[PDB]
Amino acid sequence: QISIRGIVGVENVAELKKSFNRHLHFTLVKDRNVATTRDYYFALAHTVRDHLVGRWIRTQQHYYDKCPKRVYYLSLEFYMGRTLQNTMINLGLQNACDEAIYQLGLDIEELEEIEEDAGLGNGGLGRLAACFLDSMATLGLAAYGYGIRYEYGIFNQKIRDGWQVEEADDWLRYGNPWEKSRPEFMLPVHFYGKVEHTNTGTKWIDTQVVLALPYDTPVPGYMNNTVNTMRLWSARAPNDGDYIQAVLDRNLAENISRVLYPNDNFFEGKELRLKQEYFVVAATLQDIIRRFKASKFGSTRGAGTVFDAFPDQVAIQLNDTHPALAIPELMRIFVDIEKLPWSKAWELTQKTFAYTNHTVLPEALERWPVDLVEKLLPRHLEIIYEINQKHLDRIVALFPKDVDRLRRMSLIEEEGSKRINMAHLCIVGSHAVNGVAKIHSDIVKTKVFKDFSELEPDKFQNKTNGITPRRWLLLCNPGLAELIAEKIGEDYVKDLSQLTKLHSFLGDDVFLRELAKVKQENKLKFSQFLETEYKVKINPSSMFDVQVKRIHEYKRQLLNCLHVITMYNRIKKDPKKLFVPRTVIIGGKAAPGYHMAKMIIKLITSVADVVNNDPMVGSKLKVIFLENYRVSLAEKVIPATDLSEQISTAGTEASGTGNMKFMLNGALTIGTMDGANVEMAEEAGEENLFIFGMRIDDVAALDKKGYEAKEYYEALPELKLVIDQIDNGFFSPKQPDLFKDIINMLFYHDRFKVFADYEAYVKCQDKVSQLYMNPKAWNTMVLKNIAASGKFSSDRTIKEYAQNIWNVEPS
Amino acid sequence: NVAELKKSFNRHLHFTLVKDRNVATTRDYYFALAHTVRDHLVGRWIRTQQHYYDKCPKRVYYLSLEFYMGRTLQNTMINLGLQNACDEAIYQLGLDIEELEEIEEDAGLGNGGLGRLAACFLDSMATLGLAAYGYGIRYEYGIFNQKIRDGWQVEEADDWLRYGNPWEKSRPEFMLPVHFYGKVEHTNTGTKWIDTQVVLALPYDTPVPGYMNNTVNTMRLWSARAPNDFNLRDGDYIQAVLDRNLAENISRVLYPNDNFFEGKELRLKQEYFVVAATLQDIIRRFKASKFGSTGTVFDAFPDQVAIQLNDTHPALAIPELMRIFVDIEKLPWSKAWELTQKTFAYTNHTVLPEALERWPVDLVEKLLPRHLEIIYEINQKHLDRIVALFPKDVDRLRRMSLIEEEGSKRINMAHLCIVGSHAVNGVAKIHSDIVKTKVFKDFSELEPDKFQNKTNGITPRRWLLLCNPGLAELIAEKIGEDYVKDLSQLTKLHSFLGDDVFLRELAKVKQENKLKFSQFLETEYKVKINPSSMFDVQVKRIHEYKRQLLNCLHVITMYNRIKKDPKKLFVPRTVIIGGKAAPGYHMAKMIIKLITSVADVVNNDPMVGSKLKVIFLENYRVSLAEKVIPATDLSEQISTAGTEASGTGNMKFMLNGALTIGTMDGANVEMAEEAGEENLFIFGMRIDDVAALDKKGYEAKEYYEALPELKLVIDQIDNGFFSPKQPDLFKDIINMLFYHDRFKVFADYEAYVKCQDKVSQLYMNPKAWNTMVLKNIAASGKFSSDRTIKEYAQNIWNVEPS
Numbered sequence A: 001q002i003s004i005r006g007i008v009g010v011e012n013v014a015e016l017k018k019s020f021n022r023h024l025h026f027t028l029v030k031d032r033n034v035a036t037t038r039d040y041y042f043a044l045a046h047t048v049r050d051h052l053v054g055r056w057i058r059t060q061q062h063y064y065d066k067c068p069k070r071v072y073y074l075s076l077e078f079y080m081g082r083t084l085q086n087t088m089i090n091l092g093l094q095n096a097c098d099e100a101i102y103q104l105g106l107d108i109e110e111l112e113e114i115e116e117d118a119g120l121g122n123g124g125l126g127r128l129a130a131c132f133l134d135s136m137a138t139l140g141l142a143a144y145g146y147g148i149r150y151e152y153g154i155f156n157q158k159i160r161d162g163w164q165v166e167e168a169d170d171w172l173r174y175g176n177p178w179e180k181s182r183p184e185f186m187l188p189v190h191f192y193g194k195v196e197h198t199n200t201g202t203k204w205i206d207t208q209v210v211l212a213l214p215y216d217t218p219v220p221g222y223m224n225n226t227v228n229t230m231r232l233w234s235a236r237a238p239n240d241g242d243y244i245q246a247v248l249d250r251n252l253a254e255n256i257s258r259v260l261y262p263n264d265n266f267f268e269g270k271e272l273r274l275k276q277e278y279f280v281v282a283a284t285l286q287d288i289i290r291r292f293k294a295s296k297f298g299s300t301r302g303a304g305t306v307f308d309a310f311p312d313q314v315a316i317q318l319n320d321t322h323p324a325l326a327i328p329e330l331m332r333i334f335v336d337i338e339k340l341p342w343s344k345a346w347e348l349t350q351k352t353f354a355y356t357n358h359t360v361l362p363e364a365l366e367r368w369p370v371d372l373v374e375k376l377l378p379r380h381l382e383i384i385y386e387i388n389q390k391h392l393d394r395i396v397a398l399f400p401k402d403v404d405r406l407r408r409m410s411l412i413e414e415e416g417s418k419r420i421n422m423a424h425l426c427i428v429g430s431h432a433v434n435g436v437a438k439i440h441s442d443i444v445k446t447k448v449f450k451d452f453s454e455l456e457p458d459k460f461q462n463k464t465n466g467i468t469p470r471r472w473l474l475l476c477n478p479g480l481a482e483l484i485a486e487k488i489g490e491d492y493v494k495d496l497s498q499l500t501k502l503h504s505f506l507g508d509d510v511f512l513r514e515l516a517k518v519k520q521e522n523k524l525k526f527s528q529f530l531e532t533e534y535k536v537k538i539n540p541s542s543m544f545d546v547q548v549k550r551i552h553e554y555k556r557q558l559l560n561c562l563h564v565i566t567m568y569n570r571i572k573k574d575p576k577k578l579f580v581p582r583t584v585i586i587g588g589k590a591a592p593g594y595h596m597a598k599m600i601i602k603l604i605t606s607v608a609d610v611v612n613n614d615p616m617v618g619s620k621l622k623v624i625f626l627e628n629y630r631v632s633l634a635e636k637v638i639p640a641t642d643l644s645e646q647i648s649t650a651g652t653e654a655s656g657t658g659n660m661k662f663m664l665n666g667a668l669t670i671g672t673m674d675g676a677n678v679e680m681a682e683e684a685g686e687e688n689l690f691i692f693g694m695r696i697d698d699v700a701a702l703d704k705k706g707y708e709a710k711e712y713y714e715a716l717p718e719l720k721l722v723i724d725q726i727d728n729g730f731f732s733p734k735q736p737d738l739f740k741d742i743i744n745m746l747f748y749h750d751r752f753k754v755f756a757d758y759e760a761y762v763k764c765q766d767k768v769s770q771l772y773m774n775p776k777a778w779n780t781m782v783l784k785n786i787a788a789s790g791k792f793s794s795d796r797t798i799k800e801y802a803q804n805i806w807n808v809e810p811s
Numbered sequence B: 001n002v003a004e005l006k007k008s009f010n011r012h013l014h015f016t017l018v019k020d021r022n023v024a025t026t027r028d029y030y031f032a033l034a035h036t037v038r039d040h041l042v043g044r045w046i047r048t049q050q051h052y053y054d055k056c057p058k059r060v061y062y063l064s065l066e067f068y069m070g071r072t073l074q075n076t077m078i079n080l081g082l083q084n085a086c087d088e089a090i091y092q093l094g095l096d097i098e099e100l101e102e103i104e105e106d107a108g109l110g111n112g113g114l115g116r117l118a119a120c121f122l123d124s125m126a127t128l129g130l131a132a133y134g135y136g137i138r139y140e141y142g143i144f145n146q147k148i149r150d151g152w153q154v155e156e157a158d159d160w161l162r163y164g165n166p167w168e169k170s171r172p173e174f175m176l177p178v179h180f181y182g183k184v185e186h187t188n189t190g191t192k193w194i195d196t197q198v199v200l201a202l203p204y205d206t207p208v209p210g211y212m213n214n215t216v217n218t219m220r221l222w223s224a225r226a227p228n229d230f231n232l233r234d235g236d237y238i239q240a241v242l243d244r245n246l247a248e249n250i251s252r253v254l255y256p257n258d259n260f261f262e263g264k265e266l267r268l269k270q271e272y273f274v275v276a277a278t279l280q281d282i283i284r285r286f287k288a289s290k291f292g293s294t295g296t297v298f299d300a301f302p303d304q305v306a307i308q309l310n311d312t313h314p315a316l317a318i319p320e321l322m323r324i325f326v327d328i329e330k331l332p333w334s335k336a337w338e339l340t341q342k343t344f345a346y347t348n349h350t351v352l353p354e355a356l357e358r359w360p361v362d363l364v365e366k367l368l369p370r371h372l373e374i375i376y377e378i379n380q381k382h383l384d385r386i387v388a389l390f391p392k393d394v395d396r397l398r399r400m401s402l403i404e405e406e407g408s409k410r411i412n413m414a415h416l417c418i419v420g421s422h423a424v425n426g427v428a429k430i431h432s433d434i435v436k437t438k439v440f441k442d443f444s445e446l447e448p449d450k451f452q453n454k455t456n457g458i459t460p461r462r463w464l465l466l467c468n469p470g471l472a473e474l475i476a477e478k479i480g481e482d483y484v485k486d487l488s489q490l491t492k493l494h495s496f497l498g499d500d501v502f503l504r505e506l507a508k509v510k511q512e513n514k515l516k517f518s519q520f521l522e523t524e525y526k527v528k529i530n531p532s533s534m535f536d537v538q539v540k541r542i543h544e545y546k547r548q549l550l551n552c553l554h555v556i557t558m559y560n561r562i563k564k565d566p567k568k569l570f571v572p573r574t575v576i577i578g579g580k581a582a583p584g585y586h587m588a589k590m591i592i593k594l595i596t597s598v599a600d601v602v603n604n605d606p607m608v609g610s611k612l613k614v615i616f617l618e619n620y621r622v623s624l625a626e627k628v629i630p631a632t633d634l635s636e637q638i639s640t641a642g643t644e645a646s647g648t649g650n651m652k653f654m655l656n657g658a659l660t661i662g663t664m665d666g667a668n669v670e671m672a673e674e675a676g677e678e679n680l681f682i683f684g685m686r687i688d689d690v691a692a693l694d695k696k697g698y699e700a701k702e703y704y705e706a707l708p709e710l711k712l713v714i715d716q717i718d719n720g721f722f723s724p725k726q727p728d729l730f731k732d733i734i735n736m737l738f739y740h741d742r743f744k745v746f747a748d749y750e751a752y753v754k755c756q757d758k759v760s761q762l763y764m765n766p767k768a769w770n771t772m773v774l775k776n777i778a779a780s781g782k783f784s785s786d787r788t789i790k791e792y793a794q795n796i797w798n799v800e801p802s
Ligand SMILES: Cc1cc(C)c(NC(=O)Nc2cc3ccccc3cc2C(=O)N[C@H](C(=O)O)[C@@H](C)OC(C)(C)C)c(C)c1
Pocket: A029, A030, A031, A033, A034, B045, B046, B049, B050, B053, B205, B218, B284, B285, B288, B289
């Protein structure tokens, strides 16, 4: 990275200070005598952005000059977090900027903390897109992310009287120094209208128009010359009763990009959401085609622009089914506008698109009513019906007698209200389909889409998820990054598999102590934060037991809560008995319409109030509901964690990525054999994780036999006490019936079988406590996790997409 | 200097626009230049703020719902002395600065004269070194863009901020809360206005450079935003977020009415919004000042603050200041009221009844319950004094009340402004006299010294140096450039009377302007323009009182004369009429359609040819005014006597070498006083003649029957000559002219046409024409807004130019 001492190094810092002062003066228009911390943040942000402009421009020129095949990552979500520190690190500028800011008499941490998260995602899906952008830039791929510039991202969460409340995430209030508005590149998007079938062919007419205006954010590679782009579209009314009302009604078009739908793993079939999906797809495809036509591969024949080489120059990855409309939109452009024959257009379409499936939970599946699609996108409905007809004609030819197979494989679900199965659309319109962990990809291929995989074996793949070690180690845990570098060099950042070199320090007491010291420093720093936000006295010798992720029945924060109450009851039963102290932290947002998740939050805060204030418990056990969990807060809590809770019901968590973050940062994992937890066990050795509970076949057996929650309740005395306390008002004395809905769910409607894993979970937790009392054995197991975490770099993931799906090479 | 401007341009294109030159747009170049120029005033902007903090001059706050600012690039270059160096830098970069200048959107945050006065005043106050800020609303959409479709006005949203605004700086850190609705409790710790809805006011600051000095003042415009904090009093999450639009709608769009009151609740919200944010900001600045430390600190407030109310639109400033002083700062009513009167002054801009702001009490009670209480108390103490002085005069109470009781009760906002201000002024001598001695006679009798005149003015930066550099240069070469800061120096040009070499130079400047504008006209309208024709121009908002219709009758009169005798001598004219109609103003829209209909016939009649062409000049606005005004030979200023409070277009034309045809109305009267009445083409009824015809009764039919030329014109309009596919299209106009014409179009037709004949005669004698032009230009000095501001400063604000 850029030097700070010596002749040149002194000048580097000098220039940065000069640029900072120039921005404060000319850009912010403030004298130092009236400037605030926020002004200083913005002055530094502009200074840092200026430092990547040369590479950003040169990267665009390079892609134009050499025509590498381009990768377009199309997603409704990019969960980017804060940009300042990540950019400084990737540009090799952090040391120099740190020094400049220090010499100016300012506190760099304070400036960095001013920045709002770009919270343009819900959880793992959106964050995967963000990690992927970093990795694709670091590997030199010609890759752009395309999404929506929501005016409001994921809501800011507060807790009031123990319940979640939502506030608007007004992240653009003070502006965004990391985007460049580019209205000259605006493109039209059409809605409603009708289809006309005339002598000149099929026309989509009488439509309403909304403009898509792009905003570009730079995506710097780690220590290279690549600066890629994230292009996010914002909706505007076209410029073309009551004049005043007509002007105000421009708000209706602009509402398309107003707010991120705050649902994680849950389908809500709202018209505004469908508009968002078509909006991002239509603007993105027009932009991609425009760039292709301007490129050196752009050429024209009698029949118009030649698209033969389009899939040799363009790969589009569909992040879940949310941008599934890209398939019929590309066909619409090829057939209605460019006049290609259907067969040729369909062939080009399949070669262009690949689809990533991110969940098998039924409630998450996009099934759009046909009548809604007919109203909003009539031509796309026609095109989808035609795709389905030609799809089913092939199936009839292959399997003349199998009538049910046609029903199973149709893109249309015909019962009651007819709906479009967007996953089926994505499968037939793409050349590759992948899941996000071995266990999940297998379920996708061999169970959920069995009929499709049988006819096209080689279509279905696995690409196990990953995380970027820039944000999720170098940035969030500089202490650990430094320790690792001291022992094995700094080449691990670009090749994370080099972490296996840490195995040379097995049995090295000095290293095991240094590792523990890093964790302790992180815990002390985070404990400062906790004690300023919450009325709690944190026991500094306690095990930090952490479950942070979106609040879900399938992720089973509720199971964790049952264990918290169990520990509480053991303490009250035997005050003098040995207890390994814990700070139990549970955090995450509930989708605002998700009743059971909101009840689970209230249960946790209610339990916390009892546990934290019981003088017989004291420093043995404290419980924190960590508010407003999001990317920047994840960067704080993850490095401070000793035990990572990854306890989804086997078969429900497609991959997980929080699990990987915790593993890389020195926490041990308690979890089920679900998602990538299975592969973490493969890499580190199963005995080096705290694995428990039903596996996917055990869940299947219990489903076959039939799940009777009451049997576990009657059989397990400790469970009985916990449940009776919750049901009878022990945790809600002013409102004894408060948790009725949770009890009813647990006993009669628990699709995720909390009680069935309780016994194994509590036994497993007891083993965790035992190991924690032996620091040498604890930290030895930690070392074995960190040293085996290399597979989970998103650089590895991206190389696999590049080689086996996109057909592009790292550069 | 040139070398560094080029370097700065390139740095902004690279780092600010993030563009390689190989993919740059013309707009990119405009923005790179705009940032380069803005950078040159930042030092003085910051140091001006420091200076006002350090030395504590009394501050002037110009509070207006409108700032009709036009474009900023050229104006800034001129005031900083950078225009010539920028032109050369841009030329060396292979570009044309005039092309870049055309990229900029107008800041069209006004309707017409009232908003443009505020803009001229900001330039003048900065040039004179006054510690002055303009306070208004940052409308997301300004005055609509006007298109003409099938001869009719159509409106398009003025999306002026689409590509950003390089001449503002957002300052969300200085946001302030504004309250609406709610209810009042009169508690033992004071009156509390509670359970209100809150809207945040986010300020955006635009620099206001003085001409060639060290002053850069500020225009601070507020933008509405929804609050974020959760309230325990707090449905669908998505809908709740979308509904933030409702609060943000307050600053969405300028109400596009000129001289017309529309009592919409959203407009009332706009008025309170600008007032509450502005007063809060002024008090914050006051408390932080050296005078903020001190029996109350506010004793010095009116020695440190003047607030000027631009018309009654920010009238709520009076009860708002009382609310803050009494409810928040805990001052006794008597002290608060004393301080309030000494702080505020009010400018009245019209006596037309349809323009008068009268808010229904029930609307104010709902939206601003505490302000209604305060207005009632102001009124009670007001009427108590009147009863004490005139115990037997019951009707005088009715006349002077702030409340009109007749059925639907309403608040007379002008009355509120009068009682709560120490000074009230009209905007030209004729108008200020009517305001004092007729409209508000009851008030002036009790407080004679309260009522003043301040005749309007225009800035000679935008309206001479910028719009007409040839004329500015020519004047400067003869008498130096002291006239820019003291326009009365133009009287020195009188000495060049009889200098035929100079008169030819003057004529050549006009001719160059005409050729350039002819190119614009041929580009935009594809009509062939006769270079030797008199450019006869009426540009201003479309109004019955401004009488574009009367002009149209003269146009048709000329057409008919040509068709009746094609061999006869005819002095050729290009007749240009332009202006926007308020969208709800039916008659204005009919008048536009009549003009475009007449134009279509006149322009395409082969018997007429190059003798006469007619243009409806589309999308009239500040930047287009700068193009047409310098190209004008004859300026039309033909409002009915007593209806135009002042006018300012009239002054612009006079400064730029046009002769004026007009009535003795508004400032036209003072233009005649300065230049000599014989050097204007004055015609028609005077204010006393209009009163006499009102007394007698106006019967339009009598003029129609007595004047053969009028009859022909009217019958043609009436019977479909100008609308053959829609013979009765103009029925509404005809009905109005005969039975409901409050502005007496026919009554001035004869004098108007006879006057127009004299203009044509003079235009055939270039020496005599240009002699009269010189006498107009040389007598235009009074109409500098620098003169106007000096008088406000001395006689109203009590501040000294610096
Ligand atoms: C309208 C405006 C214009 C400019 C150029 C600035 N930037 C700026 O540096 N202004 C100031 C510089 C100062 C330097 C030395 C001493 C005092 C200075 C004051 C300002 C300045 O504009 N003061 C501000 C003002 O007068 O509105 C704010 C910060 O002060 C209050 C909160 C009390 C109202 C600011 C902050 C506002």
